[PDB]
RNA sequence: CCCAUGAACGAGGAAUUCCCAGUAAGUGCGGGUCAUAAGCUUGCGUUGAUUAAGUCCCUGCCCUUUGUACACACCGCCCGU
RNA sequence: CGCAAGACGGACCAGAGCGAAAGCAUUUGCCAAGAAUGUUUUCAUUAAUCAAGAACGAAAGUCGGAGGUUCGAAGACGAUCAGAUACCGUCGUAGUUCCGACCAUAAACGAUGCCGACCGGCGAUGCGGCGGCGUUAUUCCCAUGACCCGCCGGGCAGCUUCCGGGAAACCAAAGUCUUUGGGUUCCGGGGGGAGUAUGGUUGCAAAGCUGAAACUUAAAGGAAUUGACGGAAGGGCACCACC
């Protein structure tokens, strides 16, 4: 996996966790 | 079958008297149909004639744009509108190891013809030069540009449009600019690059006929 | 369609996609001063003479 | 590992160089990294010289030329074979080919 | 019809040759360029889109233009050959050379030849991306 | 082997074998198999060209430079759902 | 042939210049700043590097306002394809432009901290100064420019070299290193987990700074060599290739 795409995936994961964790 | 060229008349276009060769060619206009007038639609027409087609001798890379402001007796009488160098000529001078210096002035003749004049010059490699490049320093370029602007203003603002065109025909302005700037940085190919009429005085037939014949 | 003479003086080489032609230098006998290049097709001998429709033709040159 | 000492560009002593678009693909390439060709071409091809010269209204018109500067990216310059890969030792030779 | 001049002296029109890489325009106009004589494009002479920029289509267009001009009394032409210009390519398309050759071939006299390609001091953004046309 | 049986073929689409001198090609005899056995093959004679004394296309052969994360060597290696 | 708008500043333009970096290219004017050079000027150690702290910081992005030409994430449609959701085409929103606030990240790279000393050669180039046959312009003396030949000082670089170093590539620094110590800041300690979790802090947001562990694993990696392969380039050969 391209490193920048893995970074984008981790960013999306963090955003989803921030949304779910209210 | 309607052929739209059966209703068109051919007029001969005449150059102003500053050029030896008077006629420049033929132009076709639809005849007068009702309100539409052939003459007034014939006016405002710009012909880009090479100088070698306007004078028997002299160079061909300089073109003059002449505008028609009157038509009498199936003859369109043109007048100066602008001047340019041909694309190949101006592309051929821009070489890659020299400085090119450009200036422009908006200057009015004594008849009220406001002209924008663009002058271009290039630094010249000396005959014994070993250095590959012939660059001028920034202050030298500014001095050359100042000289070019001053000479252009002096040559245009003091006299009228007829003598302006008379001296533009051999490009004497560029020659005196080059002679003047030989002392700051020897210049190589100095031409008044372009001339355009920004604003012209109100039309009167006397001056136009004076510029003819 | 004027026709003049041309005779081979120098076989410059072989051209064509699959060795079709010979780029050869030919002189005009009527002038004996001009040398032109022709992609002549066929076996060519040095010094042969041929009647031609063309007197100014040139082909791909290298 | 470093392939070239100059990194395939002429950027020495500055930080940023303005880009230009490749004439072949419209790719942004730095002006120093772009590969530049300056073509001078007769506007009339060699085969058409005779016809135009014969049909001219003047005598000895000397036909005008065409001055076009082409800027290529590395990919388009390689595909068009303007430049090509060289041996590790022949790479360092900056002397232009004879012409 | 036509002018009223002696037949030895040429009557000059101006031929604008807009040779792009998609198709080619042959457009004869008055010396001023305001009034047109004929305009034949390579797409009017072929049925395939790919062939509109071909040298053959340009040759056909030039022959049509030359015949029409001879029918109207114009015997000589000034050439103003241009490429697309602007952001896009500055080189003439495939049909320009054949168009000029066919204009001269059909007995039409040729005067001044000029390159009037529109050249920007500098321009808006070019059509491709920053990575270009990648196919 | 003797009589009778004239179907189809009017020198035949695209792709496409093979051929430079006593060769291609036409032509018959011989050896192999063999109850005596040739539409095949292997030799021989006989008759016998305009074929071009070139290029690498679109065919293979990988020679040099070049890239490589392959070395089980691209039928490799490898990323993610 | 005209008018309007918003961008941008070609060619000249370079292994050229300036700037702390990001970055900076139409003319002219104003404004303050700066390096180098020149100096038998002045002060006289005032210096170097730097926790804390601070200024600036591409692009994209956020908020408000103006503008909106072009291009254009998203999106719509047309193609290509087994499929394409992509490449390619026609449009096109945010954006791209400017003003005021935010963000503080880039392969922000020379993947190379700053200051000082020493250690080869050569030809160039940019600025300043010094010296000198001769050639040109100022249409006249000197001077001043443009050349030419050198020298000196900083600068961007280049070529070369058994200085020396290095795993090598390669580097006149990446040298003066087991013959190891000129000064000082930041920082690494097998590969993953992971720049993740969590806490703190900053931000309107996007996110930035700081930053683990359990667990998993015998290699991951660097440079170079020989092969093999390449939808890389250039050649050569055989009528089992072509003409």
Protein residues with beta carbon less than 7 Å from any atom of strand F: A 1; C 14, 16-19, 42-43; D 3, 85-88, 90
Residue D89's nearest nucleotide, by CA–C1', is F65
B49 φ, ψ (degrees, to nearest 5): -100, 130
Chains D and B touch (3+ CB pairs under 8 A): yes
How are beta strands D35-42 and D19-21 bridged, if at all? unpaired
Distances, alpha carbon C1 to alpha carbons C4, C29, C52, C53, in Å = 10, 18, 10, 6
* B interface test, pick of D42, D64, D69 with most B CB neighbours within 10 Å: D64
How are beta strands B8-14 and B75-85 bridged, if at all? parallel
CB B82 within 8 A of CB B195: yes
Q: Which of residues 67-126 of B touch D (CB under 8 A)?
A: 86-88, 91-92, 96
Rounded Cα distance between D23 and D34, Å, is: 11
Kindly give, in sequence order, each residue whose CB lies less than 8 Å from that of residue B186, ignoring residues fewer than 6 positions away.
B123, B124, B126
Hey, how many other C-beta atoms are within 10 angstroms of the C-beta on E44?
Answer: 15
CB B81 within 8 A of CB B65: yes
Hey, how many other C-beta atoms are within 10 angstroms of the C-beta on D2?
Answer: 5
Hey, how many other C-beta atoms are within 10 angstroms of the C-beta on B114?
Answer: 15
* Alpha helix segments (H runs only) across chain B: 38-42, 87-93, 138-157, 161-168, 172-181, 205-210
Chains C and A touch (3+ CB pairs under 8 A): no
Tell me which H or E stretch contains B199: strand B191-199
Chains A and D touch (3+ CB pairs under 8 A): no
Give the tokens for residue D20. Answer: 């230009």
Tell me which H or E stretch contains E78: strand E76-82
Interface check D67 vs B, CB under 8 A = yes
Hey, how many other C-beta atoms are within 10 angstroms of the C-beta on E22?
Answer: 13
Q: Do D25 and E127 touch (CB under 8 A)?
A: no
Q: Which domain holds residue D16?
A: 1-99
Handedness of CA E88, E93, E96, E97 (dihedral sign): positive
CB B122 within 8 A of CB B110: no
B145 φ, ψ (degrees, to nearest 5): -65, -40
How are beta strands B114-122 and B23-30 bridged, if at all? unpaired
Q: Which residue of D has its CA nearest to E131?
A: D27
Can you give the CATH number for the domain in which D52 is found?
Answer: 3.30.1740.20
Tell me the CA end-to-end span of chain B in Å, nearest whole number. 44
Q: Do E115 and D43 touch (CB under 8 A)?
A: yes
Rounded Cα distance between D16 and D14, Å, is: 6
* B interface test, pick of E32, E80, E81, E112 with most B CB neighbours within 10 Å: E32
Q: Convert B93-111 to b/e letters by CB count within 10 Å (16 or more is b).
A: beeeebbebebbbebbbee
Q: Which residue of B has its CA nearest to E9?
A: B25
Question: Nearest-CA distance from D48 to chain C in Å?
Answer: 11
Rounded Cα distance between D33 and D19, Å, is: 9
Residue tagged 């049509």 (tokens): E64
Asked if B172 CB < 7 A from strand G, the reply is: no
Domains in chain B: how many in total? 1
A16 φ, ψ (degrees, to nearest 5): -65, -40
Q: Which domain holds residue B154?
A: 6-213
**What is the experimental method?**
cryo-EM
Nearest to E2 by CA among C15, B27, D47, B81: B27
Give the tokens for residue E62. Answer: 């030039």
Domains in chain D: how many in total? 1
Nearest residue, CB atoms, D57 vs list E111, E115, E130 = E111
Q: Do D46 and C56 touch (CB under 8 A)?
A: no
Rounded Cα distance between B145 and B149, Å, is: 6
E57 φ, ψ (degrees, to nearest 5): -65, -40
All domains of chain E in start order, with CATH = 1-135 (3.30.420.80)
The angle that helices B138-157 and B172-181 make with each other, rounded to 10 degrees, is: 140
User: CA D5 – C1' G117 distance (Å)?
Assistant: 29
Rounded Cα distance between B136 and B123, Å, is: 7
User: CA D75 – C1' G8 distance (Å)?
Assistant: 26
Distances, alpha carbon E107 to alpha carbons B81, B99, D96, E6, E86, in Å = 34, 45, 44, 18, 34
Rounded Cα distance between D25 and E132, Å, is: 5
CB B113 within 8 A of CB B165: no
Give the tokens for residue E133. Answer: 């046309």
Total CB pairs under 8 A between chain D and E: 72
Measured to protein CB atoms, the chain G nucleotides within 7 Å are 1-2, 6-19, 21-29, 69-73, 87-90, 110-112, 124-128, 134-138, 144-149, 155-160, 169-171, 174, 194-198, 206-207, 222-224, 232-234, 242-243
Q: Is residue B84 part of a domain?
A: yes
Q: Is residue B1 part of a domain?
A: no
Residue ranges of E strands in chain A: none
| Three-state DSSP class for residue B98 | strand
CB B37 within 8 A of CB B31: no
């Amino acid at each position: 996996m391209r490193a920048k795409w893995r970074k984008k995936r981790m960013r999306r994961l963090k955003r989803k966790r921030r949304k779910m964790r209210q | 079958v309607v052929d739209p060229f059966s209703k068109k008349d051919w007029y001969d276009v005449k150059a102003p008297a500053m050029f030896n060769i008077r006629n420049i060619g033929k132009t076709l206009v639809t005849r007068t149909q009702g309100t539409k007038i052939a003459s007034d639609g014939l006016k405002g027409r710009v012909f880009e004639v090479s100088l070698a087609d306007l004078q028997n001798d002299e160079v061909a890379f300089r073109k003059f744009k002449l505008i028609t402001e009157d038509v009498q007796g199936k003859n369109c009488l043109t007048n100066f509108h602008g001047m340019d160098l041909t694309r190949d000529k101006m592309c051929s001078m821009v070489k890659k190891w020299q400085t090119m210096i450009e200036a422009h002035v908006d200057v009015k003749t004594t008849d009220g013809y406001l002209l924008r004049l663009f002058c271009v010059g290039f630094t010249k490699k000396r005959n014994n030069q070993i250095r590959k490049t012939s660059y001028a320093q920034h202050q030298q370029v500014r001095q050359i540009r100042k000289k070019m602007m001053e000479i252009m203003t002096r040559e245009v603002q003091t006299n009228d449009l007829k003598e302006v065109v008379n001296k533009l025909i051999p490009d004497s302005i560029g020659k005196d600019i080059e002679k003047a700037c030989q002392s700051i940085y020897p210049l190589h190919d100095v031409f008044v690059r372009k001339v355009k009429m920004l604003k012209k005085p109100k039309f009167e037939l006397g001056k136009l006929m004076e510029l003819h014949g | 369609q004027p026709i003049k003479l041309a005779r081979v003086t120098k076989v410059l080489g072989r051209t064509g996609s699959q060795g079709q032609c010979t780029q050869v230098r030919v002189e005009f006998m009527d002038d004996t001063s001009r040398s032109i290049i022709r992609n002549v097709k066929g076996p060519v001998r040095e010094g042969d003479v041929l009647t031609l429709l063309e007197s100014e033709r040139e082909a791909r040159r290298l | 590992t470093k392939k070239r000492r100059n990194n395939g560009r002429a950027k020495k002593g500055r930080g940023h160089v303005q880009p230009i678009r490749c004439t072949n693909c419209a790719r942004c390439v730095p002006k120093d990294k772009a590969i530049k060709k300056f073509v001078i071409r007769n506007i009339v091809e060699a085969a058409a010289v005779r016809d135009i010269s014969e049909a001219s209204v003047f005598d000895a018109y000397v036909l005008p030329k065409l001055y076009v500067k082409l800027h290529y990216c590395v990919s388009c310059v390689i595909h068009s074979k303007v430049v090509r890969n060289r041996s590790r030792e022949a790479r360092k030779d900056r002397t232009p080919p004879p012409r | 019809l036509g002018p009223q001049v002696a037949e030895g002296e040429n009557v000059f029109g101006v031929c604008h040759i807009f040779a792009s890489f998609n198709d080619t325009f042959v457009h004869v106009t008055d010396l001023s360029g305001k009034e047109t004589i004929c305009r034949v494009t390579g797409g009017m002479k072929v049925k395939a889109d790919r062939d509109e920029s071909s040298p053959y289509a340009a040759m056909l267009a030039a022959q049509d233009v030359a015949q029409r001009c001879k029918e109207l009394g114009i015997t000589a032409l000034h050439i103003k050959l241009r490429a697309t210009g602007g952001n896009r390519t500055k080189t003439p398309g495939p049909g320009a050379q054949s168009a000029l050759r066919a204009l001269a071939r059909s007995g039409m006299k040729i005067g001044r030849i000029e390159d009037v390609t529109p050249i920007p001091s500098d321009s808006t953004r070019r059509k491709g991306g920053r990575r270009g046309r990648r196919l």
